[PDB]
Design a binder for this molecule. Sequence first.
Ligand code: A1AH2
Lengths: 215, 216
Amino acid sequence: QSALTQPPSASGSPGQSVTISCTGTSSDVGGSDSVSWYQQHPGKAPKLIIYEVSQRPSGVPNRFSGSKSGNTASLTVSGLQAEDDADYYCSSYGGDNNLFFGGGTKVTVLGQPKAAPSVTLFPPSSEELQANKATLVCLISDFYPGAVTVAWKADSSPVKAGVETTTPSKQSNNKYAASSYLSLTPEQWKSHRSYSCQVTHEGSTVEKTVAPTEC
Amino acid sequence: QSALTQPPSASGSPGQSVTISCTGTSSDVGGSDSVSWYQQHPGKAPKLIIYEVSQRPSGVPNRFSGSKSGNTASLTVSGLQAEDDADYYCSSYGGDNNLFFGGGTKVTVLGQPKAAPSVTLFPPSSEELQANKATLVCLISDFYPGAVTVAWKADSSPVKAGVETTTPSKQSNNKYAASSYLSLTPEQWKSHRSYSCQVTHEGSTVEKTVAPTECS
Ligand SMILES: Cc1cc(OC[C@@H](C)c2ccccc2)cc(=O)n1CCOC(=O)NCc1cccc(-c2c[nH]cn2)c1
């Protein structure tokens, strides 16, 4: 969706190192040395931390380093500190006077053990079907860090319209939970082989699939 | 490191206009026409809506207009809509390869309409019952303001344990969504006549009930 591609998330414990990538094309990332990186603590103003691939503004510690190889730029944060937990965005000049941005990378400094999500995909309930709705819901619970990306497939084809995913919230067990729901019509639901929920967490994807049944 | 100066807060009613300012110095905002504005909904990536003081990227409505006078840039959002409720940041390049950002302005769209939740209750799926699990999910969507309370029933008796409800989050229709889910064993699910989800929003309660399926 974003012009430049960044991994959705990275994580590490205090003192560890983490590298996050920013992939474009030869006409942006690979067409000059104009890659910048920005840091944002959620709800706060962002801050430029790297410009022209490798240059650190004043005040930015040398724990942060930027490099580029071909059409991929990389930001390395060595010796993670608590204040490095933030969202990180890249940008690059394009072909002509155009500025391209990546989708952002959530960098977590692990505050607790990592936990993969429990993924449960529910087909349409009877009551909503007889109200001419065929909403599917994909329940995602008990994960840490609280970053997740969800993709839906109709058969094998990506489906963007009708998808809603809730912002992960921390539950009573101190692990995160969210739900993605796909608002189908009964016709859409009954006319496909199946639908799938793809849940990505800590660089690993899990997929669940449901299909219509007679009863 | 120094910031541009934006008011913390601004507001307006639907259809009204709102103007927010971004005050810099002669060597940033006043130094050239490199002022940008970004819109960001909480928990989402931001969206550049203005660059070079006044230029809108593709797909940005012409309700958003940017200008500059001296050291102060201004964004005006006319015809306010619920989706304009968000944080707005300005930026400006200076010399020395510097990029300055304002602290951000939270624009509030006042008096958005109340909306009762849609409630959809799902019984355990085939796959999880196979896996010796019986989680129920109560999907709650399309409600405003974003506060709900959820109670569960086993037959007619209150369910006091195994309940989790997510913090409501605003979705693409500018209304809130949440899920309550009840972790049951397959035995609990099968031993009862039904389970119900009771969602209370603004003093009004919606109740849904599901029972072990009679299919095969
Ligand atoms: C993801 C993201 C980040 C971003 O952070 C800025 C950072 C300072 C910041 C950070 C935190 C808080 C505030 C600001 C800005 C931003 O706009 N995005 C969305 C990117 O959208 C696209 O790539 N869309 C397709 C696309 C395709 C081709 C051209 C364009 C185009 C032309 N002219 C403008 N866009 C767009």
